Design a binder for this molecule. Structure first.
Ligand SMILES: Nc1ncnc2c1ncn2[C@@H]1O[C@H](COP(=O)(O)OP(=O)(O)OP(=O)(O)O)[C@@H](O)[C@H]1O
Ligand SMILES: Nc1ncnc2c1ncn2[C@@H]1O[C@H](COP(=O)(O)OP(=O)(O)OP(=O)(O)O)[C@@H](O)[C@H]1O
Ligand SMILES: Nc1ncnc2c1ncn2[C@@H]1O[C@H](COP(=O)(O)OP(=O)(O)OP(=O)(O)O)[C@@H](O)[C@H]1O
Ligand SMILES: Nc1ncnc2c1ncn2[C@@H]1O[C@H](COP(=O)(O)OP(=O)(O)OP(=O)(O)O)[C@@H](O)[C@H]1O
Ligand SMILES: [Mg+2]
Ligand SMILES: [Mg+2]
Ligand SMILES: [Mg+2]
Ligand SMILES: [Mg+2]
Ligand SMILES: [Mg+2]
Ligand SMILES: [Mg+2]
Ligand SMILES: [Mg+2]
Ligand SMILES: [Mg+2]
Lengths: 492, 485
């Protein structure tokens, strides 16, 4: 064809983007990675989605796992390949060794095997092929040279059969060689790499595309997650910056704060709250998530610091009954330690909840939690992720941070995430006469006017009470202020 | 001959400059690189370009990728190699293995195949040749020593045929051996290394001319981007310091500000709008992007922070409409996440849009939005990338930056780029009586005068209202002044 290479939609969440459309039609795609990296899950989903959505039959070749196991584990994702097999949509070409034994199985092996597949493809009238672990075929007594030629013998004949193919290969080191004999990376056109990089004691999983001949594809690692719906990727680096924005306002929970923002927050606008531990991030989150229920709008509350109980105790002591917010089915609390998963994990989880319950507000208390460990970048990416989604979804997200140091916060981010957020509220203690009192400012609003006053405030059983600035002080921001004025009242 | 080495032009964007002209004529060039770097593309473009600019024909000996494919993959770029092998200007030499089975045909090996290519050349009167994946030939059963002979046998056989050659090799370790059997390196007159380095879950293609027997060449790695129009290379080191400069002037969009700078900004200048988060860098941004329309000049506005829809929101709330602008084709908008491309890449996109919309003013709201998880160096390289081009291009660019700390920041830029820009505008807060009030202040201008004081300014529907300074104060810079009665 005088037309450039066309791809085949895989239907695997994210892959299509990274792959700018899917797997190059008519060609074989090498998909290597270490153990437990989802290589087989990759090929099964490929063949599968193609049957469920494009009614494209698929042939599955396996050189190790007995068909029975394959169908079994499929049930992990609620997949009854078993059926698609019985309706002729799926056909597993068992090519695994017998627990008995026969010598010299490399001569007729491939060639005879090729024709077998040819028969399979041709017979069931298929469009998708997955050959699981070609690596386990030359693992009899061969070396680099023999390997090379053999793949080319298979990638090519298959190519003559014109079927979109997926081959799986194993790896020994994580960032070491691409495949085993360091020879497939070439004899193949398209080489996808699924990693399970260590780092720390958490394992994060990326998926890359070293190359698709003739076409384009996002370059680099993008994390993905294996779940009850298979592989899920997150094209973090692909998400378009075209999110909608309204001029609509909503409330923060405390009306006086609703004034200092020029009439509330904007439905479409990420909101952060900073302060050293104790100022009151939570109190603001509390009244925030609450405010959203009194209007009949659902709002999830992900906490990573406090428990579900304690999150309902201290809450009560400020009035407001979460308990009721839950019953009416207008509030939802998640709670989960940060060391319970990697950022790639929470992001999906949060994204997940947002899909079932479809909140009207979002309140993640403590970006500072998730920031634990995880290198500054990895986290930064998380942030966009959350923010960028919640934004292009029209939800009001209040976030929380906690300055690494009380009094003297020379940086309202302590990780420089400022710029990602739209509204900024700042809490700070203030040493006023041997007494640490609260202060509260609306640092910046992107669409409104907001108040430029560094108002003090007190916390009681009602909640926050935004009073009057400290006009008669120098070095307020310094946390330890200074009294001014040198004239009282006397005669003329 | 009695004179210097005559090079041949590759026409490969930027390469002629890194090689100082092109490939040493009649001499082969070994271009290696791991899988997915473009080695094929490099050599296919080489032959190709020779066909559409010089009419110098080409022989593409292909050992592993099938002729038909070689032709198909080139359509990705808009290249009709099918048409060129018809017009007999390019010839693809099918030197691949049999998809079936045969072992006793290549017993004349190296020699036989050379006789072929030498025939074809004399038949199409070709001038350039590329052998794609020669390593794949030996990949039958050879030792480092068997290669050095076979290769030196070919290379030479092709030197004698006064043919200017480009052989392709493949690597396995990015910064390790140049080729597979660490032998080709010394067997070829010229060495080109293609690297797809990772480092930080991100890839970056860098090209390098290791050596060129004969003449000089640029030294080291240069970044490159594989795109519809093939290999594109930016020799940020080959860009001299020769930009036309003038005293003409332009407005900042804020009349006051124009006076503060001694009557508007200079046309041929890079202005920087540093400041804390919120100080209003994006306020001035829109401003300077609008005055370019009231004067019927095209102005592009590259965004990397706020949406295009949101921009068009806060725009309207400061007065001045952005909708109109675009319609009249006097204001183009961009938008993209800094993580949505690599620096090497972001750079090119700019150049791209510019060439297409011939702006007169460029706005890059937050260079500090790009520095994201990038190497201080890499990034400095990205500023000079833009800055320079916009200079030589006589464009007037406005760049936004946000310091990693409000009030007290002990530098204009935490990445130290100031000494790159000509005019630095500077926003910072100042705590006046339990309050947060803004304060603009031109910090420096290389050709003009510009006021020296820090005037407080307020923002409102109509815009930036630069007022008067904090005379009766002290340490207004320390963000928390001391009113001295
Ligand atoms: N429903 C599921 N939910 C969460 N994780 C799952 C689920 N099913 C499988 N996994 C995880 O996925 C992995 C299975 O990997 P998979 O079988 O897809 O391919 P592989 O390990 O790359 O290659 P191979 O098939 O040779 O083992 C397991 O390590 C397991 O932790
Ligand atoms: N019922 C109450 N009455 C008066 N003060 C209260 C009451 N509950 C909490 N406080 C005060 O509020 C602060 C608790 O902080 P809060 O619950 O708002 O979360 P935070 O400041 O955001 O985060 P963290 O406490 O984890 O640092 C304490 O410093 C305490 O003095
Ligand atoms: N039109 C295109 N647009 C964007 N990227 C492309 C396009 N065509 C190819 N590419 C990219 O360029 C790479 C092509 O490299 P190429 O196939 O030319 O040679 P190689 O990687 O050096 O050697 P080989 O692929 O033969 O093993 C692919 O990995 C792909 O990411
Ligand atoms: N219509 C308006 N009326 C009054 N004040 C406004 C208005 N719009 C914005 N502001 C003020 O301007 C600031 C907003 O900053 P702006 O939109 O100019 O971009 P920035 O300061 O350059 O960058 P960033 O938003 O990333 O911090 C807020 O801090 C706010 O006080
Ligand atoms: Mg396995
Ligand atoms: Mg497997
Ligand atoms: Mg290769
Ligand atoms: Mg807390
Ligand atoms: Mg190649
Ligand atoms: Mg030497
Ligand atoms: Mg900002
Ligand atoms: Mg901004």
């Amino acid at each position: 064809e005088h037309q450039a290479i066309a791809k085949m939609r895989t239907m695997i969440e994210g892959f299509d983007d990274i792959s700018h459309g899917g797997l190059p039609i008519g060609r074989s795609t090498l998909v290597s990675g270490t153990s437990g990296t989802g290589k087989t899950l990759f090929s099964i989903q490929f063949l599968y989605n193609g049957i469920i959505e494009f009614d494209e039959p698929g042939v599955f070749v396996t050189f190790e796992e007995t068909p029975q196991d394959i169908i079994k584990n499929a049930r992990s994702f609620g997949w009854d390949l078993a059926k698609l097999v019985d309706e002729g949509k799926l056909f597993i070409l068992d090519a695994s060794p017998d627990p008995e034994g026969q010598e010299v199985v490399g001569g007729f092996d491939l060639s005879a095997l090729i024709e077998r597949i040819n028969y399979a493809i041709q017979k069931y009238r298929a469009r998708r092929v997955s050959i699981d672990s070609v690596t386990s075929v030359f693992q009899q007594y061969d070396a680099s040279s023999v390997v090379r030629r053999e793949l080319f013998r298979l990638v090519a004949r298959l190519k003559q059969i014109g079927a979109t193919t997926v081959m799986t290969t194993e790896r020994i080191e994580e960032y070491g060689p691409i495949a085993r004999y360091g020879v497939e990376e070439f004899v193949s056109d398209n080489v996808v790499i699924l990693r399970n990089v260590l780092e720390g004691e958490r394992r994060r999983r990326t998926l890359e595309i070293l190359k698709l001949r003739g076409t384009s594809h996002m370059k680099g690692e993008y994390p993905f997650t294996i779940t009850d719906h298979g592989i899920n990727i997150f094209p973090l680096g692909a998400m378009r910056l075209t999110q909608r924005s309204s001029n609509v306002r909503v409330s923060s929970g405390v009306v006086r704060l609703d004034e200092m923002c020029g009439g509330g927050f904007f439905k479409d606008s990420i909101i952060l709250a900073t302060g050293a531990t104790g100022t009151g991030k939570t109190l603001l989150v509390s009244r925030f998530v609450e405010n959203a229920c009194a209007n009949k709008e659902r709002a999830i509350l992900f906490a990573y610091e406090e428990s579900r109980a304690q999150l309902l105790r201290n809450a009560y002591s400020w009035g407001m009954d979460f308990e009721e917010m839950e019953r009416q089915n207008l509030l939802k609390i998640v709670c989960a330690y940060p060391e319970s998963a990697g950022l790639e994990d929470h992001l999906q989880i949060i994204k997940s909840e947002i899909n079932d319950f479809k909140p009207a507000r979002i309140a993640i208390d403590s970006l500072s939690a998730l920031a634990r460990g995880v290198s500054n970048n990895a986290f930064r990416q998380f942030v966009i992720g959350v923010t960028g989604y919640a934004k292009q979804e029209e939800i009001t997200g209040l976030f929380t941070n906690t300055s690494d140091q009380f009094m003297g916060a020379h940086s309202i981010t302590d990780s420089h995430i400022a710029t990602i957020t739209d509204t900024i509220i700042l809490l700070q203690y203030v040493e006023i006469r041997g007494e640490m009192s609260r202060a509260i400012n609306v640092f910046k609003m992107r669409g409104s006017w907001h108040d430029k006053a560094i108002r003090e405030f007190m916390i009681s059983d009602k909640g926050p009470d935004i009073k009057d600035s400290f006009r008669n002080f120098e070095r307020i921001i310094s946390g330890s202020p200074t009294r001014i004025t040198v004239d009282e009242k006397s005669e003329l």
